[PDB]
Write a protein that binds this ligand. Structure first.
Ligand SMILES: Nc1ncnc2c1ncn2[C@@H]1O[C@H](COP(=O)(O)OP(=O)(O)O)[C@@H](O)[C@H]1O
Ligand SMILES: Nc1ncnc2c1ncn2[C@@H]1O[C@H](COP(=O)(O)OP(=O)(O)O)[C@@H](O)[C@H]1O
Ligand SMILES: Nc1ncnc2c1ncn2[C@@H]1O[C@H](COP(=O)(O)OP(=O)(O)O)[C@@H](O)[C@H]1O
Ligand SMILES: Nc1ncnc2c1ncn2[C@@H]1O[C@H](COP(=O)(O)OP(=O)(O)O)[C@@H](O)[C@H]1O
Ligand SMILES: [Mg+2]
Ligand SMILES: [Mg+2]
Ligand SMILES: [Mg+2]
Ligand SMILES: [Mg+2]
Lengths: 374, 374, 374, 374
């Protein structure tokens, strides 16, 4: 008589997005933090709570300590992590998770001690009829409507690439880097002490993160800008703190995003973001390199810096031979690319035969996810 | 009022040609390979097939393993071989094989365990009204319009000669060599590692084969060219890979085709291609040697190397006595010589009495081919 | 008045061994790496060097980047490679290379652009009175004191086989595979992320390599062990990192060495180590296959895994016909088999007439090595 | 208590037999082949010879090319042929040929350019005191102890008959055929490709020859056996190759020896072995035909096929008139019949006056053999 749908929860590491299948945008988006008070309080006639989750913690962050339940794509705290899902199902979507299947996302090359515990939580605490776990990068390709190209995923905790030629994925060419937005925010705080501003409290870290995504951009030619910025002052901008003071940042605007292409700034030795894509392609066969060069897809929040498309094209061209053409495909909605691909996949007619049923969990539940989602 | 035609299928070993009788060119030509995927695939919304046959496999050869159903003129796989014929009858010629007789070709000195199974397949699976099997080399003589001369057949798996004086064939002078294009391609890969290029995958073998038939030629004087090529550099050519890189080959241009005249390079002890023709002629009677010397006919794909006619004339002259004249007849269309001869033979007025009827198969079908085609 | 000896330098790809002729063991063994600092340093009163070569780099590897001058048996860097030889001649053997002939080793089927540059370095920079280059696998047979059998060489960069019947070698049966210890170490790092341990730095790669040669073994029956290891826990061992933490590895003990017999794990399509030996033997004549089956000789560092002799016998028996007996000869000192054979060869009375003299280099020096060592 | 031993060699074409006079069996028997290496060799510490003669070549035939110095009873190579005699005199009989007369055998109707060169070799290189040349077939009659009958000689290169009535020989009735064991071996290789086994190398020809003299027999009624062999399978036998594989031959057991009675199989037009004997007898006078019919003597290696005596009796009876009785005399030791007759002849008291002395050679040596041995 009625019909059902499927929830898509792109958990990620740093921001949680939830919604219903069939739509083109998430319904609820909120940062994933857990805060606790650190004082005693003197007032008696107040309904003082014990823990704040989600947007509420972002409001009263002057008297709390904020802790992130997920670090580098691997969840470390489970008591706090249970609270995040409990908030999403009840106070945001207002849907009881007992008749609607759930779909999750998870980064590649992670311990399968993680995927085991995800099965235990949702099949015991909430008792969902079905669930499935998919790679984040693969879902990004569904949004573009294409089945050929190498996808670059760069969220807040991890950065990985996976090539797909045509309906097949090569598992031996997957790479991974532990360099993402969290490392850039800590780097910006280190170099913002240059002008006399010092932020040390975890509450003040949120203020620094806001500056990063409001005034930073990637320079087309790094060396030329430093000469220009040193002489004149046309690149200086002013920002206003919540306290009322005004701060001005000069050459720091493009020094922070430049760390993506030169990881040597942070003290880590590794290839840049542009060189990782080149190495991934060269690990494929000789007849696939032509199509992959003409289809490169970007995704993730970190990629949203203005002018990042032009710089990536220049870097790849100098490395690849001059005969073929290099094209970077950067859709304007790349921030929600992962979530949209999840909605399309869960609505396919032929995908309904791949769910993990409640009956299957009864026999070898903690180990079924390894083989059925391989 | 309505007449039926006859299909000619020069199966060969390495390339299949099909067409209708009465024409001067085959209608469908495609390599005979069968490919299967070797990965798992992650995409759901794709019509992923299980096996690719013919030109389709040559397109997506970056994710497949290619296997040849025929090796050295003897078919080894029958499940894959059935697929090749099924593709030819339906998806290329678009004719139902239930009212048109079929004609095949087959190399001499092969096991008649082979010709038995060919009868079983076409008289049970497709139920053709009639069929006939003929020697490949004999059909080549019909195209030239002559009935006197020794024909040299050199395809991709076998190389054989058969002399015919006048309307009669001598069965005791037929020779055979297991040296053909497949051995040359493997030899080229072995010596192409000299300059740093290494091809090992079966998909990369197709790239090496393309180079062979685009840049190789036979030298008139082998020893003189090596002295010339070593000093100067006017014999160097450049080729472009599908990946975009450029490769240059020097003295390797004529080292590969030279293996035909000196089989000692490959580690096999045997006479060269030129010496085999001499030995075949000397096995005939004393009054036939004059006419055979003045009519030598070449055929097959391997013979298409430029400058092979001049070298063969020089080799034979040094062996035969100086009195008679040696002439090598190399028509410009020798690549399709076998097929054209099949079309003419099937259209003869007096050949219609030699078909193998469906009634004859009922009594001693698996054994009738031995006596009726003798 | 005095007498001369000959130095033997089994260069290999990954470890260098040097010594004097007539002995039974190398005098100096050290890894072949070159390291450079990646920081600036603040201390003034220190004798800070610019580059570290050999065992010194292995000590202070916490602040250096290690680079291998040789990859896959083909040297890529010559400035760094010159440093390795300079260290060996002076700081380890303490002998001036101006009166003692030198002997080298080199893998088969390599570009002879390589052997040309080896001649240039030793005849100009050091000016050695004589030198000679020999195949690695052939030298291994001298140590066994036998002249009949197929030798399997598996070092760190290459894996090749060459058959020798009796005093003669067949050059058309030599095979080669690009699968060696370096590929196994990278594979172990990929699957060691399963339990939460992540090594990414080139300095941390040396730690992973140490685990491989201290806790890994080859299982007699691969499928049976997985069933046993999954249920019980008697196959688990513990290892201690330099930092102090303890790590435990379960079924990963035998999953890494199993990649030798099934190259499909790494994404490469090729025959296993056992199947390559079978194909090499079948390329010989019909009367040689009996003696080669009864004499198989192993060598190289990779072959030192416990229990590899028993597994190889089982694999060959299933392929070869049951009549003959299969014997695998694995001497306990197979790690130094190549070097010992070099010492014996350089001490033979009849070998002194095959050196390349300084006079010969003056005429056609860069090209004499091709013909005199053929 | 003293005599001059005689060395008696029945050179033949395909096998050499040597021994001393007065014995009943040859002392040394070995195939007459000469082999040379066709590779280069890498080993230094080996006593590698340049040419192998006799039984040694039969051992290491996997790396050599075997050449027969004698073809069709006419020696073609003299440098190789000198080596065969040098081996026999020194390394097998261990007797210096300077005091013992030598006796040879030679087929009839051969060029007396041959017998001239035999005189030159033994009277210059070895300087034997005396020598004599005799017809092979005549010597066969001495072994039987009879002086009336027609002898059939069929070795490996030639087949000839000569009638002798009583103490006299008729020179105008001698016949000759170029059909012997060598033609049968080549025929067997041609029809053994029927079942999929292909032997092409000269080393593999020796394996085919071994099968011929171990599993072949002559059928009493050719047409009846084919009907029997086609229906049932009681005539199939299995043979084991040196490699270990097993092969089975069906009706090929008696198809090869049948070519002797029907030369039309090989493409040669001639009378059979049975018809040649009939034609030879009919060339004699009318009063001799009765005794010759009752005494037919066989000899040679080719005649050793089982059941050849019964078939020959049936063939002759149908041709000759029914009045007289036909008897075929086939002694069990017919393989050494020629040699034994040589031993008896050289020991006769009245034969010592027919030697060719060293003094006679000085005047007209190259021409004395024509008249003194007429
Ligand atoms: N406009 C922007 N410019 C730069 N960085 C941005 C921008 N918007 C978001 N980010 C970065 O995106 C990071 C999170 O990316 P996101 O894709 O939301 O993570 P996840 O993949 O876990 O959902 C933040 O930590 C922030 O630094
Ligand atoms: N232009 C060319 N130059 C050199 N070789 C060629 C050329 N065209 C075809 N060949 C060779 O001819 C072979 C094809 O022979 P084919 O006609 O298929 O014989 P068959 O039909 O008996 O199998 C291929 O293996 C290829 O190497
Ligand atoms: N005990 C061991 N167990 C497993 N592997 C080993 C052991 N000892 C050495 N190896 C492997 O052998 C390799 C060394 O090979 P080596 O003898 O240097 O070859 P080459 O001299 O040709 O370079 C190392 O990479 C290492 O992985
Ligand atoms: N048992 C046998 N069955 C069949 N053929 C045989 C047998 N023994 C020997 N032969 C044939 O006889 C030949 C040997 O003849 P041989 O006595 O050497 O003649 P000659 O001495 O004149 O050379 C061989 O080629 C072999 O084929
Ligand atoms: Mg994301
Ligand atoms: Mg052809
Ligand atoms: Mg080694
Ligand atoms: Mg004889």
């Amino acid at each position: 008589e009625e019909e059902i749908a499927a929830l898509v929860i792109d958990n990620g590491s740093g921001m949680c997005k939830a919604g219903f299948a069939g739509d083109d945008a998430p319904r609820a988006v909120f940062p994933s933090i857990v805060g606790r008070p650190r004082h005693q309080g003197v007032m008696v006639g107040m309904g003082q709570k014990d823990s704040y989750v989600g947007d509420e913690a972002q409001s009263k962050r002057g008297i709390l300590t904020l802790k992130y339940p997920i670090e580098h794509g691997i969840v470390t705290n489970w008591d706090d992590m249970e609270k995040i899902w409990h908030h999403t199902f009840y106070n945001e979507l207002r849907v009881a998770p007992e008749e609607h299947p759930v779909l999750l996302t998870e980064a590649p090359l992670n311990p399968k001690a993680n995927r085991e515990k995800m099965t235990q939580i949702m099949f015991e605490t909430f008792n969902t009829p079905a669930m499935y776990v998919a790679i984040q990068a693969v879902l990004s390709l569904y949004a573009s409507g294409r089945t050929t190209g190498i996808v670059m995923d760069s969220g807040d905790g991890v950065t990985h690439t996976v090539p797909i030629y045509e309906g097949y994925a090569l598992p031996h060419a997957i790479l991974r880097l532990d360099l993402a937005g969290r490392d850039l925010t800590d780097y910006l705080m280190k170099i913002l002490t240059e002008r006399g501003y010092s932020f040390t409290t975890t509450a003040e870290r949120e203020i620094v993160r806001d500056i990063k995504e409001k005034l930073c951009y990637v320079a087309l030619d790094f060396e030329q800008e430093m000469a220009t910025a040193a002489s004149s002052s046309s690149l200086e901008k002013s920002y206003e703190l919540p306290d009322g003071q005004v701060i001005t940042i000069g050459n720091e605007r493009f020094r922070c995003p430049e760390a993506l292409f030169q990881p040597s700034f942070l003290g880590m030795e590794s290839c840049g973001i542009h060189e990782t894509t080149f190495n991934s392609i060269m690990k494929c066969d000789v007849d696939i390199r032509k199509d992959l060069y003409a289809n490169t897809v970007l995704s993730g929040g970190t990629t949203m810096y203005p002018g990042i498309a032009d710089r990536m094209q220049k870097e790849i061209t100098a490395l690849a031979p001059s005969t073929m053409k290099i094209k970077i495909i950067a859709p304007p909605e790349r921030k929600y690319s992962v979530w949209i691909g999840g909605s399309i996949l869960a609505s396919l007619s032929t995908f309904q035969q791949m769910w993990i049923s409640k009956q299957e969990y009864d026999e070898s539940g903690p180990s079924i996810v390894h083989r059925k989602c391989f």
